[PDB]
Amino acid sequence: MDTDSEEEIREAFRVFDKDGNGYISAADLRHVMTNLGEKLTDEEVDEMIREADIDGDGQVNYEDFVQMMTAK
Template sequence: MVGLDDCENKSNLGEEDLVGLFEEEEPSFEEIKETFKVFDVDEDGFVGAADLQRVVRSLGLKEHCSLDECREMIKPFDQNSDGFIDFHEFVTFMEKCLC
């Protein structure tokens, strides 16, 4: 299994934190969709810096997570450089980091 340390993104989210969101070691497509919805609260189909900041803070993983820091966390997985993670990019992130 590839850990988060092996991914391009060096955020403070640990592998255990992400794996803990799923019932099995390898998440199903449905579980990935549900996880994306956790980040995409406004249901616009994208995860932006503010979305990521809200989730990181709610998980207590980083007390002071600025929008700039969240933008930097998004960059390595933002394949089209629009400043957001769409569902396809999110799936790619999950595959690289958890499977």
């Protein structure tokens, strides 16, 4: 028991985006989120994106998403 390597995620959000520059859409967000740490509920995730999206929803920052991944 000692972390699970939060580096595989950095490339996960970087490889997912091709026509961007370190920023994905809600779709890619709900996907990576719903698919990473066990199966979550559409309701629980709804609140997750509310924070990881500059209060609300829209475009999420790659760096930010990575910052929380380091320490949560």
